[PDB]
Amino acid sequence: AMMEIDELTALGGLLHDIGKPVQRAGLYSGDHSTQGARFLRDLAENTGRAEYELLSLFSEFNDELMIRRIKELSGLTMEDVLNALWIVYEADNLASGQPQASRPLYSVFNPGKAYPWAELDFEKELPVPGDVFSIRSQDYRELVKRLWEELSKAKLRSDRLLPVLEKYLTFVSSVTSEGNIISLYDHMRMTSAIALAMLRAGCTAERKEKRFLLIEGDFSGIQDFIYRVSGKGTLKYLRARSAYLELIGWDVVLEILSRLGLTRANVVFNAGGHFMIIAQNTPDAVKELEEIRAKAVEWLYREFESDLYLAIEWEPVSGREFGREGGKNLFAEARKRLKHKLTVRKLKNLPKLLGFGRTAKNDAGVLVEGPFSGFVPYPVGEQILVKNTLNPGEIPESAQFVPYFVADYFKKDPKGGVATFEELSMASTGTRRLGVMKGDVDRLGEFFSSMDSPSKLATASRFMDYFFKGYIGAIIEGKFGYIIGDVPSLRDWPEEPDIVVVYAGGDDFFIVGAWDQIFELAFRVRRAFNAYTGGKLTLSVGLGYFDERTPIYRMADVVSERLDTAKDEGRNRVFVVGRSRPLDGKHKLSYEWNHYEELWRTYAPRIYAGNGRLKGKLESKKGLLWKLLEIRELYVRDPNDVRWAYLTAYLLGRHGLSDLFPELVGIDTKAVERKEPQPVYWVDGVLKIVLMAVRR
């Protein structure tokens, strides 16, 4: 039952700073060192063996004091303790290198803003960095109150303590200083990872060497593998090949963790096929890193080939290359080299599924095969990929709890299934067209270069994944209404939204559904993502409204190209709908987020009354709307001509509505001197959406 050296150094570095949150509470006294060991020495007495008694040493720290304190306690042979001791202390400096105590965690997205005291919940708890408000010890006490009962309930192993230290110590600062963006969990996460790594590199206690590895693995034709197959099909399949990539990813990762004997703490992240792990630089490691790779590159060939391929590379880095020396980002510069190898070689469903169980490849009863292992739709056996949760509750036969989050929301088809393309479009408002949204985060890669430590990396990457894989579901189901506020809408948000996510991630998200529920959702995500990142990180989104019975890849290239246009036009934008324009390099197609939302808010209430209805004053005058659009088409052919204003003046008088649209009737030279175009140009993106919401 206990204890190994590749579980003492890990869990030791995993709990080396467990004394901080209890020090920020009212429990013990002295520094976090004393209170942490005092917490673990007491936890050994709490519903369990005398286990954490020895684990308390890592948080307990002089050289006279340490050598005559290990004897009192144990097997290790009084040998594997002193060596595992100094290792942990160095990992912290490698992780990140009178403060306060009530200082809140600040946002990695916005250092000027901090996270208000709220529990971690992907439902009804969207994290919003606000003004700096100090934290009371009473809130830490009731925090530890849960942290006390869960650390005791959960078993003593990495797959058990990692999610508990993550479930509670996420939105708490690691170092109480003004501007600290390093999460507590992420801080003590790599301290386990880096320590375990260097121990494998032969870093027994006695300085800077090449005994450290930094491996990253990712695929290539991911998008061309999901929605560009050309085989019925369809929607259900899009999700299937999406829910397959998640298995292939971990599979390749969980094979690395086993063979090299690592933990999930070494895994910085792993989602949608993109992952990066921290390992050690040894000839043993490389030998099986090449072994795993060589066969990983050989398996997709005999299954998908010629379809998709995997690219895994690793760069030998040094221990000092983890921070800043004289204003030099040694870490990102090392991360830069690693990213180069990838790009270079890149050139060359519905029933009860709570998760997957990693089995032996020869065993049956599975649902699909993998590169190194099979998977059973769910308890068996050792490693089980449990979905969207932090709680295991399974056999204690060394069952490696592997939690994974994924955006897998879908409109539920009757008799318990997944809605199809026609089921999403039939629930549309007005015209019955299918809605397709696609986009990414503006310059997400350059955000990974601003950081300087592995700590900031783990925090920024994890928070990132929390949105598109966690909080995106509560957004789609229609929550966080106060934060998001009023948004462009064709209707009120349904009981169960007609929205299906093929896949969602910061790098790219593909979501389909009812066109009017796709339109509004595009703004709900933005305003949330703006608030989630403090308004520091933005999105680009292309919106398509195609026919129900139309090939997905054909209607994917369009949205992807509409997306490219939004990026090409400067990056924060939304491509609502395709439209005509004058070609002079002055009129853009995509809308700016704040711009379009103001246009909707100002113009839509003039004509639209909600839920497929127009305002009362717009009765028997449906012809006015599109006839005001054709007048705009005149502007399209010649802007510098008041052919649009004169006609958008008396046509209203014929119908007796000379009060509305004061910007389309009058001339606006005031905007001409700004190089910008007329308000009549943009008004179609509001009229057409309303019109297709009231057709038939």
mmCIF file of all heavy atoms in Angstrom, residues 523 526 539 566 569-576 579 588-600 674 676-677 682:
data_model
loop_
_atom_site.group_PDB
_atom_site.id
_atom_site.type_symbol
_atom_site.label_atom_id
_atom_site.label_comp_id
_atom_site.label_asym_id
_atom_site.label_seq_id
_atom_site.Cartn_x
_atom_site.Cartn_y
_atom_site.Cartn_z
ATOM 1 N N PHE A 523 -23.415 36.060 -30.049
ATOM 2 C CA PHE A 523 -23.198 37.256 -29.244
ATOM 3 C C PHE A 523 -23.144 36.917 -27.761
ATOM 4 O O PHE A 523 -22.468 37.597 -26.986
ATOM 5 C CB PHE A 523 -24.294 38.287 -29.515
ATOM 6 C CG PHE A 523 -24.337 38.759 -30.938
ATOM 7 C CD1 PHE A 523 -25.093 38.085 -31.883
ATOM 8 C CD2 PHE A 523 -23.618 39.874 -31.334
ATOM 9 C CE1 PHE A 523 -25.133 38.511 -33.195
ATOM 10 C CE2 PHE A 523 -23.655 40.309 -32.646
ATOM 11 C CZ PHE A 523 -24.413 39.624 -33.578
ATOM 12 N N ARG A 526 -19.614 35.854 -27.156
ATOM 13 C CA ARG A 526 -18.700 36.991 -27.209
ATOM 14 C C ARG A 526 -18.700 37.804 -25.918
ATOM 15 O O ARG A 526 -17.648 38.027 -25.319
ATOM 16 C CB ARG A 526 -19.046 37.902 -28.390
ATOM 17 C CG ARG A 526 -18.169 39.141 -28.487
ATOM 18 C CD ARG A 526 -18.934 40.412 -28.144
ATOM 19 N NE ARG A 526 -18.028 41.530 -27.897
ATOM 20 C CZ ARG A 526 -18.415 42.791 -27.725
ATOM 21 N NH1 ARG A 526 -19.701 43.112 -27.781
ATOM 22 N NH2 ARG A 526 -17.512 43.735 -27.504
ATOM 23 N N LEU A 539 -12.814 37.448 -30.053
ATOM 24 C CA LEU A 539 -13.172 36.343 -30.933
ATOM 25 C C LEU A 539 -13.500 36.826 -32.340
ATOM 26 O O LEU A 539 -13.927 37.963 -32.536
ATOM 27 C CB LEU A 539 -14.371 35.575 -30.374
ATOM 28 C CG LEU A 539 -14.231 34.878 -29.022
ATOM 29 C CD1 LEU A 539 -15.554 34.246 -28.619
ATOM 30 C CD2 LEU A 539 -13.132 33.836 -29.068
ATOM 31 N N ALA A 566 -13.220 38.112 -41.545
ATOM 32 C CA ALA A 566 -13.324 38.846 -40.288
ATOM 33 C C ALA A 566 -11.944 39.085 -39.690
ATOM 34 O O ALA A 566 -11.656 40.166 -39.176
ATOM 35 C CB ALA A 566 -14.207 38.096 -39.306
ATOM 36 N N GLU A 569 -10.067 41.583 -41.791
ATOM 37 C CA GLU A 569 -10.541 42.946 -41.609
ATOM 38 C C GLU A 569 -10.223 43.488 -40.215
ATOM 39 O O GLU A 569 -10.762 44.515 -39.807
ATOM 40 C CB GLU A 569 -12.043 43.024 -41.887
ATOM 41 C CG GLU A 569 -12.395 42.810 -43.352
ATOM 42 C CD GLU A 569 -13.883 42.875 -43.615
ATOM 43 O OE1 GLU A 569 -14.661 42.874 -42.639
ATOM 44 O OE2 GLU A 569 -14.276 42.934 -44.798
ATOM 45 N N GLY A 570 -9.350 42.795 -39.488
ATOM 46 C CA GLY A 570 -8.789 43.338 -38.263
ATOM 47 C C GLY A 570 -9.114 42.648 -36.949
ATOM 48 O O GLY A 570 -8.938 43.248 -35.890
ATOM 49 N N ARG A 571 -9.695 41.442 -36.996
ATOM 50 C CA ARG A 571 -9.883 40.603 -35.787
ATOM 51 C C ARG A 571 -10.658 40.326 -34.461
ATOM 52 O O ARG A 571 -10.175 39.624 -33.572
ATOM 53 C CB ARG A 571 -8.931 41.081 -34.682
ATOM 54 C CG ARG A 571 -7.542 40.470 -34.754
ATOM 55 C CD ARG A 571 -7.605 38.997 -35.120
ATOM 56 N NE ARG A 571 -6.399 38.554 -35.815
ATOM 57 C CZ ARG A 571 -6.311 38.397 -37.131
ATOM 58 N NH1 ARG A 571 -7.360 38.649 -37.902
ATOM 59 N NH2 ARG A 571 -5.174 37.989 -37.678
ATOM 60 N N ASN A 572 -11.853 40.895 -34.366
ATOM 61 C CA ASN A 572 -12.579 41.046 -33.106
ATOM 62 C C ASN A 572 -13.961 40.910 -33.739
ATOM 63 O O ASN A 572 -14.963 40.730 -33.048
ATOM 64 C CB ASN A 572 -12.066 42.208 -32.245
ATOM 65 C CG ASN A 572 -13.039 42.607 -31.148
ATOM 66 O OD1 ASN A 572 -13.715 41.763 -30.563
ATOM 67 N ND2 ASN A 572 -13.118 43.904 -30.873
ATOM 68 N N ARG A 573 -14.008 41.016 -35.061
ATOM 69 C CA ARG A 573 -15.272 40.966 -35.781
ATOM 70 C C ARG A 573 -16.225 39.791 -35.940
ATOM 71 O O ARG A 573 -15.879 38.647 -35.641
ATOM 72 C CB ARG A 573 -14.750 41.399 -37.153
ATOM 73 C CG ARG A 573 -13.849 42.619 -37.114
ATOM 74 C CD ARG A 573 -13.306 42.960 -38.484
ATOM 75 N NE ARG A 573 -14.292 43.665 -39.295
ATOM 76 C CZ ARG A 573 -14.494 44.976 -39.240
ATOM 77 N NH1 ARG A 573 -13.779 45.723 -38.412
ATOM 78 N NH2 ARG A 573 -15.412 45.541 -40.011
ATOM 79 N N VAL A 574 -17.429 40.086 -36.416
ATOM 80 C CA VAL A 574 -18.425 39.058 -36.660
ATOM 81 C C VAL A 574 -18.959 39.164 -38.084
ATOM 82 O O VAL A 574 -19.345 40.242 -38.541
ATOM 83 C CB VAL A 574 -19.594 39.149 -35.651
ATOM 84 C CG1 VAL A 574 -20.128 40.575 -35.559
ATOM 85 C CG2 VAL A 574 -20.701 38.171 -36.019
ATOM 86 N N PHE A 575 -18.953 38.041 -38.794
ATOM 87 C CA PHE A 575 -19.524 37.985 -40.130
ATOM 88 C C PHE A 575 -20.942 37.447 -40.030
ATOM 89 O O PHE A 575 -21.162 36.239 -40.102
ATOM 90 C CB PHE A 575 -18.677 37.108 -41.053
ATOM 91 C CG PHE A 575 -18.878 37.395 -42.516
ATOM 92 C CD1 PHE A 575 -17.901 38.051 -43.245
ATOM 93 C CD2 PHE A 575 -20.037 37.000 -43.163
ATOM 94 C CE1 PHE A 575 -18.079 38.312 -44.589
ATOM 95 C CE2 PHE A 575 -20.221 37.262 -44.507
ATOM 96 C CZ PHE A 575 -19.239 37.918 -45.221
ATOM 97 N N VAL A 576 -21.896 38.353 -39.852
ATOM 98 C CA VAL A 576 -23.289 37.976 -39.666
ATOM 99 C C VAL A 576 -23.843 37.261 -40.894
ATOM 100 O O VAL A 576 -24.222 36.093 -40.825
ATOM 101 C CB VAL A 576 -24.161 39.205 -39.356
ATOM 102 C CG1 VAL A 576 -25.611 38.792 -39.167
ATOM 103 C CG2 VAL A 576 -23.641 39.922 -38.119
ATOM 104 N N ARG A 579 -23.229 39.821 -47.950
ATOM 105 C CA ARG A 579 -23.987 40.930 -48.512
ATOM 106 C C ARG A 579 -23.191 41.702 -49.557
ATOM 107 O O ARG A 579 -21.964 41.613 -49.612
ATOM 108 C CB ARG A 579 -24.433 41.878 -47.401
ATOM 109 C CG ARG A 579 -23.299 42.647 -46.747
ATOM 110 C CD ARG A 579 -23.799 43.411 -45.537
ATOM 111 N NE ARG A 579 -22.882 44.468 -45.129
ATOM 112 C CZ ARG A 579 -21.863 44.283 -44.300
ATOM 113 N NH1 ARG A 579 -21.634 43.080 -43.799
ATOM 114 N NH2 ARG A 579 -21.074 45.298 -43.975
ATOM 115 N N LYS A 588 -16.238 47.310 -45.510
ATOM 116 C CA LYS A 588 -15.925 45.965 -45.050
ATOM 117 C C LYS A 588 -17.185 45.118 -44.909
ATOM 118 O O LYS A 588 -18.284 45.645 -44.746
ATOM 119 C CB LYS A 588 -15.165 46.020 -43.724
ATOM 120 C CG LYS A 588 -13.776 46.620 -43.850
ATOM 121 C CD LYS A 588 -13.008 46.560 -42.542
ATOM 122 C CE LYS A 588 -11.607 47.124 -42.710
ATOM 123 N NZ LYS A 588 -10.805 47.021 -41.462
ATOM 124 N N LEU A 589 -17.015 43.803 -44.979
ATOM 125 C CA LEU A 589 -18.137 42.876 -44.907
ATOM 126 C C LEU A 589 -18.478 42.504 -43.469
ATOM 127 O O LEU A 589 -19.617 42.655 -43.036
ATOM 128 C CB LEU A 589 -17.831 41.616 -45.716
ATOM 129 C CG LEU A 589 -17.849 41.777 -47.236
ATOM 130 C CD1 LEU A 589 -17.333 40.521 -47.915
ATOM 131 C CD2 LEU A 589 -19.257 42.097 -47.707
ATOM 132 N N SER A 590 -17.488 42.015 -42.731
ATOM 133 C CA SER A 590 -17.699 41.634 -41.340
ATOM 134 C C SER A 590 -18.030 42.850 -40.480
ATOM 135 O O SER A 590 -17.593 43.963 -40.769
ATOM 136 C CB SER A 590 -16.465 40.918 -40.785
ATOM 137 O OG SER A 590 -15.341 41.782 -40.768
ATOM 138 N N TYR A 591 -18.811 42.628 -39.428
ATOM 139 C CA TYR A 591 -19.167 43.690 -38.496
ATOM 140 C C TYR A 591 -18.277 43.655 -37.264
ATOM 141 O O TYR A 591 -17.840 42.590 -36.835
ATOM 142 C CB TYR A 591 -20.630 43.568 -38.063
ATOM 143 C CG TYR A 591 -21.642 43.739 -39.171
ATOM 144 C CD1 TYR A 591 -22.042 42.657 -39.945
ATOM 145 C CD2 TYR A 591 -22.211 44.978 -39.431
ATOM 146 C CE1 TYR A 591 -22.973 42.809 -40.954
ATOM 147 C CE2 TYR A 591 -23.142 45.139 -40.437
ATOM 148 C CZ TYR A 591 -23.518 44.052 -41.196
ATOM 149 O OH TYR A 591 -24.444 44.209 -42.201
ATOM 150 N N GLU A 592 -18.013 44.823 -36.693
ATOM 151 C CA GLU A 592 -17.374 44.886 -35.388
ATOM 152 C C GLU A 592 -18.419 44.544 -34.334
ATOM 153 O O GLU A 592 -19.581 44.924 -34.471
ATOM 154 C CB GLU A 592 -16.773 46.268 -35.140
ATOM 155 C CG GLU A 592 -15.627 46.604 -36.075
ATOM 156 C CD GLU A 592 -15.185 48.047 -35.962
ATOM 157 O OE1 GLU A 592 -16.061 48.932 -35.874
ATOM 158 O OE2 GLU A 592 -13.961 48.295 -35.970
ATOM 159 N N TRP A 593 -18.007 43.818 -33.298
ATOM 160 C CA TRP A 593 -18.938 43.308 -32.293
ATOM 161 C C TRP A 593 -19.806 44.403 -31.683
ATOM 162 O O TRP A 593 -21.032 44.333 -31.748
ATOM 163 C CB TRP A 593 -18.181 42.576 -31.184
ATOM 164 C CG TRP A 593 -17.590 41.269 -31.611
ATOM 165 C CD1 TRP A 593 -16.277 41.004 -31.852
ATOM 166 C CD2 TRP A 593 -18.295 40.043 -31.849
ATOM 167 N NE1 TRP A 593 -16.115 39.692 -32.224
ATOM 168 C CE2 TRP A 593 -17.340 39.080 -32.230
ATOM 169 C CE3 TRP A 593 -19.640 39.668 -31.775
ATOM 170 C CZ2 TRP A 593 -17.686 37.766 -32.536
ATOM 171 C CZ3 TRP A 593 -19.980 38.363 -32.079
ATOM 172 C CH2 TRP A 593 -19.007 37.428 -32.456
ATOM 173 N N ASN A 594 -19.170 45.412 -31.096
ATOM 174 C CA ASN A 594 -19.899 46.520 -30.489
ATOM 175 C C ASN A 594 -20.697 47.309 -31.521
ATOM 176 O O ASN A 594 -21.764 47.842 -31.218
ATOM 177 C CB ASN A 594 -18.940 47.453 -29.750
ATOM 178 C CG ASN A 594 -18.245 46.773 -28.590
ATOM 179 O OD1 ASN A 594 -17.021 46.650 -28.571
ATOM 180 N ND2 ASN A 594 -19.026 46.328 -27.612
ATOM 181 N N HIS A 595 -20.173 47.373 -32.739
ATOM 182 C CA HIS A 595 -20.819 48.102 -33.823
ATOM 183 C C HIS A 595 -22.159 47.478 -34.208
ATOM 184 O O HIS A 595 -23.181 48.162 -34.222
ATOM 185 C CB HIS A 595 -19.899 48.165 -35.043
ATOM 186 C CG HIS A 595 -20.452 48.960 -36.186
ATOM 187 N ND1 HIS A 595 -19.909 48.923 -37.450
ATOM 188 C CD2 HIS A 595 -21.500 49.818 -36.250
ATOM 189 C CE1 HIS A 595 -20.597 49.720 -38.247
ATOM 190 N NE2 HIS A 595 -21.567 50.274 -37.546
ATOM 191 N N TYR A 596 -22.154 46.185 -34.518
ATOM 192 C CA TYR A 596 -23.372 45.508 -34.951
ATOM 193 C C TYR A 596 -24.420 45.470 -33.848
ATOM 194 O O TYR A 596 -25.611 45.630 -34.111
ATOM 195 C CB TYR A 596 -23.074 44.081 -35.419
ATOM 196 C CG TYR A 596 -24.299 43.356 -35.939
ATOM 197 C CD1 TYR A 596 -24.690 43.474 -37.266
ATOM 198 C CD2 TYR A 596 -25.072 42.562 -35.100
ATOM 199 C CE1 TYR A 596 -25.812 42.820 -37.744
ATOM 200 C CE2 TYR A 596 -26.196 41.906 -35.569
ATOM 201 C CZ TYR A 596 -26.560 42.038 -36.892
ATOM 202 O OH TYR A 596 -27.677 41.385 -37.365
ATOM 203 N N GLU A 597 -23.974 45.250 -32.617
ATOM 204 C CA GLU A 597 -24.888 45.153 -31.484
ATOM 205 C C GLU A 597 -25.592 46.480 -31.230
ATOM 206 O O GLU A 597 -26.720 46.507 -30.742
ATOM 207 C CB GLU A 597 -24.141 44.698 -30.228
ATOM 208 C CG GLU A 597 -23.645 43.263 -30.295
ATOM 209 C CD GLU A 597 -22.948 42.824 -29.024
ATOM 210 O OE1 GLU A 597 -23.021 43.562 -28.019
ATOM 211 O OE2 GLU A 597 -22.326 41.739 -29.030
ATOM 212 N N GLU A 598 -24.925 47.580 -31.567
ATOM 213 C CA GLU A 598 -25.534 48.899 -31.454
ATOM 214 C C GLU A 598 -26.526 49.123 -32.591
ATOM 215 O O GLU A 598 -27.576 49.733 -32.398
ATOM 216 C CB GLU A 598 -24.465 49.994 -31.454
ATOM 217 C CG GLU A 598 -25.023 51.398 -31.275
ATOM 218 C CD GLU A 598 -23.943 52.428 -31.002
ATOM 219 O OE1 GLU A 598 -22.758 52.041 -30.913
ATOM 220 O OE2 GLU A 598 -24.280 53.623 -30.871
ATOM 221 N N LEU A 599 -26.184 48.624 -33.776
ATOM 222 C CA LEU A 599 -27.067 48.717 -34.933
ATOM 223 C C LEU A 599 -28.358 47.943 -34.704
ATOM 224 O O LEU A 599 -29.441 48.416 -35.040
ATOM 225 C CB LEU A 599 -26.371 48.195 -36.190
ATOM 226 C CG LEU A 599 -25.170 48.986 -36.705
ATOM 227 C CD1 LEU A 599 -24.628 48.336 -37.963
ATOM 228 C CD2 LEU A 599 -25.549 50.435 -36.963
ATOM 229 N N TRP A 600 -28.234 46.748 -34.138
ATOM 230 C CA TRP A 600 -29.401 45.934 -33.824
ATOM 231 C C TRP A 600 -30.270 46.626 -32.783
ATOM 232 O O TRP A 600 -31.459 46.844 -33.000
ATOM 233 C CB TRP A 600 -28.982 44.552 -33.324
ATOM 234 C CG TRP A 600 -30.140 43.705 -32.906
ATOM 235 C CD1 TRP A 600 -30.710 43.645 -31.665
ATOM 236 C CD2 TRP A 600 -30.881 42.797 -33.729
ATOM 237 N NE1 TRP A 600 -31.757 42.756 -31.667
ATOM 238 C CE2 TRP A 600 -31.882 42.222 -32.923
ATOM 239 C CE3 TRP A 600 -30.793 42.415 -35.071
ATOM 240 C CZ2 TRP A 600 -32.788 41.286 -33.413
ATOM 241 C CZ3 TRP A 600 -31.693 41.486 -35.555
ATOM 242 C CH2 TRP A 600 -32.678 40.931 -34.729
ATOM 243 N N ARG A 674 -14.314 60.941 -42.286
ATOM 244 C CA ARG A 674 -13.712 59.915 -41.443
ATOM 245 C C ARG A 674 -13.297 58.700 -42.265
ATOM 246 O O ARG A 674 -12.756 57.732 -41.730
ATOM 247 C CB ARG A 674 -14.680 59.496 -40.335
ATOM 248 C CG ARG A 674 -15.004 60.600 -39.344
ATOM 249 C CD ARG A 674 -13.925 60.720 -38.279
ATOM 250 N NE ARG A 674 -13.452 59.414 -37.829
ATOM 251 C CZ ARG A 674 -14.066 58.673 -36.913
ATOM 252 N NH1 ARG A 674 -15.183 59.108 -36.344
ATOM 253 N NH2 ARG A 674 -13.565 57.496 -36.564
ATOM 254 N N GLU A 676 -15.069 56.595 -43.333
ATOM 255 C CA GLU A 676 -16.062 55.555 -43.090
ATOM 256 C C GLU A 676 -17.208 55.636 -44.092
ATOM 257 O O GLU A 676 -17.294 56.597 -44.867
ATOM 258 C CB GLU A 676 -16.637 55.685 -41.679
ATOM 259 C CG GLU A 676 -15.590 55.886 -40.596
ATOM 260 C CD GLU A 676 -14.610 54.731 -40.513
ATOM 261 O OE1 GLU A 676 -15.016 53.583 -40.790
ATOM 262 O OE2 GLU A 676 -13.433 54.973 -40.170
ATOM 263 N N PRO A 677 -18.119 54.569 -44.058
ATOM 264 C CA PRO A 677 -19.202 54.696 -45.043
ATOM 265 C C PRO A 677 -20.514 55.120 -44.394
ATOM 266 O O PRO A 677 -20.554 55.371 -43.190
ATOM 267 C CB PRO A 677 -19.446 53.237 -45.426
ATOM 268 C CG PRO A 677 -19.257 52.475 -44.155
ATOM 269 C CD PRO A 677 -18.496 53.346 -43.190
ATOM 270 N N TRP A 682 -24.792 49.554 -43.732
ATOM 271 C CA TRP A 682 -24.771 48.491 -42.733
ATOM 272 C C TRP A 682 -26.158 47.968 -42.375
ATOM 273 O O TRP A 682 -26.289 46.907 -41.768
ATOM 274 C CB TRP A 682 -24.080 48.985 -41.460
ATOM 275 C CG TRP A 682 -22.741 49.605 -41.692
ATOM 276 C CD1 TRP A 682 -22.463 50.935 -41.804
ATOM 277 C CD2 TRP A 682 -21.492 48.920 -41.832
ATOM 278 N NE1 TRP A 682 -21.119 51.122 -42.008
ATOM 279 C CE2 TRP A 682 -20.500 49.900 -42.029
ATOM 280 C CE3 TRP A 682 -21.118 47.574 -41.812
ATOM 281 C CZ2 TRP A 682 -19.158 49.577 -42.205
ATOM 282 C CZ3 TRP A 682 -19.784 47.254 -41.986
ATOM 283 C CH2 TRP A 682 -18.820 48.251 -42.181
#
